[PDB]
Amino acid sequence: MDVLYSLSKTLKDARDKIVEGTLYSNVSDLIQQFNQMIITMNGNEFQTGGIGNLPIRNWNFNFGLLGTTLLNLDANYVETARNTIDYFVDFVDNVCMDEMVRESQRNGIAPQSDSLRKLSAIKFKRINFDNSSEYIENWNLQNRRQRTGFTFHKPNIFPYSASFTLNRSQPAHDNLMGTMWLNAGSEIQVAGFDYSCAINAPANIQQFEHIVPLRRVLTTATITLLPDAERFSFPRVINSADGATTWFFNPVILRPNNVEVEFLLNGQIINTYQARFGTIVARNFDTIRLSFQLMRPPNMTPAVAVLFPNAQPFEHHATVGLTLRIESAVCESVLADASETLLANVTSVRQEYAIPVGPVFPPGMNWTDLITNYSPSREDNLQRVFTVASIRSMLIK
């Protein structure tokens, strides 16, 4: 993998630095690395493809070295360099695609493509250059069993889940108490509703709890916490738990009472925020516990009093809410985020070449299913494919 990254990095540096008219002192070391790559690759043959519709291509290498005599690079030098670089970049592209379209249930971190297995040989180790990218750096750290970390903007951690739980219910669904929630990407929206508005609840308070566990531990996360859930604040017709019928939800929003957001790591309270909204920091956690109450307003004006009676015909249903967005985070594992295009690249290559479903990833690289069952084997395969995808995107635009 490091050899593949080195090939990509040296080709990128060659395309950026070997330009007409530049001094040879700007490219002396780069050309030494390039000639080392050419010498190490010459005489070897590779084969990429043969899975799904990905074409089978044979790659041979016989390239003269780049010269070391000009004071300033000229058109001839750049033409030769680019004619070599184009072939090398195509070979890297196809190696990366072949690696991305493959997965393995056992030894998922190891190379899966024939070409990457060949490049894993010691003879190619001389083409190592530097490992400066975040993904390759974490690849090396993971190989060394050292602590890793990827910085994500809006991490796609929570699998899509729009659901509701009812703690009080009747077949008529006319006097309900419960919670509704949407967890998607980096957003949690939870609403606790009570149709009776806690008229008879002890102390005229109804308690609501929402426990969202994560499949991976996040660290140093910035979180925006807002005191309302706009997604559960308008009239709804919702099909019941079993789908046998439908119930009506006509909410009236009150402020959430005694809001407590706890970020727990292995069941230990790492961070706690009481009635604090806005930007907060969770340094280390694997589960989020949102606790909020609906308190019946002790004093009501006539309008609110008419809204909330003491008899069964509850036309308006009291509702409180919380919204929790994860703006940024750090995770020792790989995830999908709103900024990077690695999930997109892997999915796109697989869809384009009609790769059959394998034994590791769910069909079509469905992120919801993957992050719902983020097994260690799936994590190994996902890191491998994402690292090779980043290597590929280093060269392909």
Partner 1 sequence: FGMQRMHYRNGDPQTPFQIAEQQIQNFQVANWLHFVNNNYFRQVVIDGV
Task: Identify the CA nearest to 395 among candidates 133, 68, 74.
Answer: 133
* Residues forming a β-bridge with 318: 194, 252
By the rule CB under 8 A, 63 interacts with partner 1: no
Site string for a second copy, 187-226 (x = CB under 8 A): --------------------------------xxxx-x-x
* Residues within window 12-31 making contact with a second copy, judged by CB under 8 A: 13, 15-17, 19-23, 25-26, 28-29
Binding partner of residue 149 among partner 1, a second copy, none, CB cut-off 5 to 8 Å per kind: a second copy
Strand bridging mode 317-331 / 251-253:
parallel
By the rule CB under 8 A, 168 interacts with a second copy: no
DSSP E strand stretches across the chain: 45-48, 57-60, 150-153, 158-168, 177-185, 187-194, 205-226, 236-239, 246-249, 251-253, 257-265, 268-274, 278-295, 317-331
- Nearer of residues 39 and 110 to partner 1, judged by Cβ: 39
By the rule CB under 8 A, 52 interacts with a second copy: no
CA distance 324 to 287: 13
By the rule CB under 8 A, 42 interacts with a second copy: no
By the rule CB under 8 A, 241 interacts with a second copy: no
By the rule CB under 8 A, 39 interacts with partner 1: yes
- Can you tell me which of 70, 110, 269, 338 binds a second copy, judged by CB under 8 A? 338
| Residues near a second copy (CB under 8 A), total | 118
Name the amino acid, one letter, at 362: P
- Can you tell me which of 266, 275, 352, 359 binds a second copy, judged by CB under 8 A? 352
- Can you tell me which of 57, 118, 216, 231 binds a second copy, judged by CB under 8 A? 231
* Residues within window 69-88 making contact with partner 1, judged by CB under 8 A: 69-71
Query: Least distance from C-beta 13 to a second copy, angstroms?
Result: 8
Q: Residue 242 gets which letter from DSSP? A: T
- Nearer of residues 32 and 220 to partner 1, judged by Cβ: 32
| Neighbour-count burial for 270-297, b at 16+ CB within 10 Å, e otherwise | bbebeeebeebebebbbbbbbbbbbbbb
User: Using CA atoms in the order 71, 76, 82, 84, what is the torsion angle rounded to 10 degrees?
Assistant: -100
Q: Where do contacts with partner 1 occur on this chain (CB under 8 A)?
A: 24-25, 32, 39, 68-71
